[PDB]
């Protein structure tokens, strides 16, 4: 198995640093820490990336990331939970959504749940004896439940603490047959407090975009991402909170279905701006620059064409499509997206 110990080391250091850091009103997860989280989830997936032929889902659900049968033999899972004589597992066992007040608690709880295949209620996403089931009624619903609980749990914290910007996404494989509009309306129609402009703004932005742009756009797809067989399509600009939230990388397989220009932002630069790679033609868009370190790495795409609904153009505005590293200045809607700062940026090609 391909086990990237580097992201386990970085994750451990992040939790040590932030364990007793109180979540205040504007507290957010830094670029470095977001990239560590992102790496951890992707490395977890890569260690045991496919189901076994004798134990697979006839619905095509990716059980290798959803069941104890696979996760307990995933060497990345095992190495992470055993790291430092199991000290993160010891801390993890003290946590639940209702008592979390600190950054490191929040990150450890959300991420260890995901890379253990556990809901916040402690149930596994899917049961082992259900791997081979063709009953879509409970297979699809279990995954909707798991996806919604990742996001709603975080909104429950944000509302209790009155925090604006903490955010970890539900990774792309947990959207198996999940309707984004229903997720959004289910959660927001049921809790008026989540609508407060000072509560859960990146969670809101992530779910809102997914409520208006479905996973598979068929003939309207302009872009397609694939990581370990999990695909996703887009026809708008793709903000960093989407790529970070879903666990996609600008180094994954990216296919263009139109001749529209895209600006693929990949790293911060040394003049307070960002460096991007431009692609134009149909076909595979391959970033061949070195992968930036966690301090500097960005994942974001601005799509340029003449047919985007005016109400959706703001997703590509510079200071919305990339998450501000100064927490209080993060943008999350058309009412505060701005498009200044381009002087500081550079086309790499």
């Amino acid at each position, epitope marked *: 198995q391909d086990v990237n110990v580097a992201s386990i080391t970085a994750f451990k250091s992040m939790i040590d640093e932030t364990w007793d850091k109180k979540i205040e009103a504007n507290t957010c997860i830094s670029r470095k820490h977001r990239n560590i989280i992102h790496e951890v989830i992707r490395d977890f997936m890569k260690a045991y990336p496919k189901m076994d032929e004798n134990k697979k889902s006839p619905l095509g659900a990716p059980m290798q990331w959803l069941t104890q049968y696979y996760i307990l033999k995933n060497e990345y899972h095992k190495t992470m939970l055993a790291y430092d004589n199991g000290s993160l597992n010891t801390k993890f066992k003290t946590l639940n959504i209702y008592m979390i007040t600190n950054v490191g608690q929040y990150i450890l709880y959300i991420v260890f749940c995901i890379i253990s295949g556990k809901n916040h*209620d*402690g*149930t596994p996403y899917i*049961y082992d004896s259900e791997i081979t089931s063709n*009953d879509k*009624n*409970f297979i699809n619903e279990r995954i909707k439940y798991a996806c919604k*609980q990742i996001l709603h749990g975080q909104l429950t914290i944000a509302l209790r603490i009155r925090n604006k910007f903490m955010f970890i996404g539900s990774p792309m494989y947990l959207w198996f047959n999940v309707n984004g509009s229903q997720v959004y309306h289910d959660i927001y129609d049921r809790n008026a407090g989540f609508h407060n402009k000072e509560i859960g703004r990146l969670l809101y932005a992530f779910m809102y975009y997914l409520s208006i742009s479905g996973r598979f756009l068929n003939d309207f797809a302009l872009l397609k991402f694939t990581y370990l067989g999990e695909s996703w399509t887009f026809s708008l600009s793709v903000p960093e909170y989407i790529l970070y939230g879903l666990g996609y990388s600008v180094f994954d397989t990216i296919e263009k279905f139109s001749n529209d220009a895209i600006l693929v932002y990949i790293r911060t630069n040394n003049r307070n701006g960002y460096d991007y790679v431009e692609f134009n033609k149909k076909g595979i868009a391959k970033v061949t620059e070195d992968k930036p370190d966690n301090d500097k790495r960005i994942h974001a795409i601005r799509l340029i064409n003449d047919s985007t609904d005016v109400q959706h153009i703001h997703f590509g505005f510079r200071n919305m499509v990339i998450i501000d590293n100064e927490c209080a200045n993060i943008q999350s809607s058309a009412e505060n997206a701005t498009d200044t700062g381009h002087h500081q940026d550079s086309k790499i090609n």
Partner: antibody
Amino acid sequence: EVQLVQSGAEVKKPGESLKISCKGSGYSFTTHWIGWVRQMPGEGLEWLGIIYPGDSETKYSPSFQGQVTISVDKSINTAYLHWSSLKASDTAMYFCARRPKNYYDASGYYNWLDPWGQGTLVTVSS
Amino acid sequence: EIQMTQSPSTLSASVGDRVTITCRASQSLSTWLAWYQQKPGKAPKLLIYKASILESGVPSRFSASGSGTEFTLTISGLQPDDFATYYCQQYNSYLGAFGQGTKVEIKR
């Protein structure tokens, strides 16, 4: 107050069709799922499937898919369980029960509600 | 849904006894477990939901606890109308499979 009233005992032959009913009163009928569960003589309980009366969305256990139909008549607050062709192995007591519209949400799961229906005994013999 | 194992199948007890019925699963059901009582020819009656919460109207001699993989229903002082069959039921499902049942009978 809340009652689920089921139709009377049935005595049928294999191959005959049958429709039994569950009448819900004293609550919002269109916004609670109705589930059907059976208990064969001397056995435990086994679910057949459920229906949401507001829009008639149905979810069948794979054991019963294609062999029964569940339906509703909203005008009389009635849910139905139908066979086009009974088997002798369908001899059992049939219960109905109701469940909240969101039987799960992002915070957890919700149980089937009391009271259940009183039960309809179906006897299938040649 | 997942297989549950309910035990014992028959519990022989007396009025006034503290009796315990157990339900186990190989993976966690969290709190999503109910307990039912059933008497001959009658519909099951809900006693407990969310693994430990008494259904409204159920007498306080009934209680229950859960760890996720092990669940216990305790009747703290059996009374003359508690002889019946009891079922656990998982309900983190659109259906929710029942345990095999426990008959509580009069000991002599």
